[PDB]
Amino acid sequence: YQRLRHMVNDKFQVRSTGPVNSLTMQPVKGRKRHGGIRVGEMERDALIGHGTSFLLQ
């Protein structure tokens, strides 16, 4: 057997609140900047497809 080099250390992150951006007041990007998770364009369409207007809100 063989052990591969790439491992799962720098993969997880959690944010309750924290830093923002100065222009948008949205959560900052960043793995080590303690930054937010992106709800992208396709996830906006997935939250309309459930008809969940408050989860989108």
Next chain:
DNA sequence: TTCAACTGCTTTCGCATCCCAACTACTTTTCCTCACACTTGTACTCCA
């Protein structure tokens, strides 16, 4: 009634000229160590 340029769009996180220096020179900083020309008697006879 058509040809030819101006036209925004392919994804989904995360990865990823001026300055410096070299070596060898020449020089300055000064402080220390003595000589070189001048002069009156004295000495050896000098001429009286």
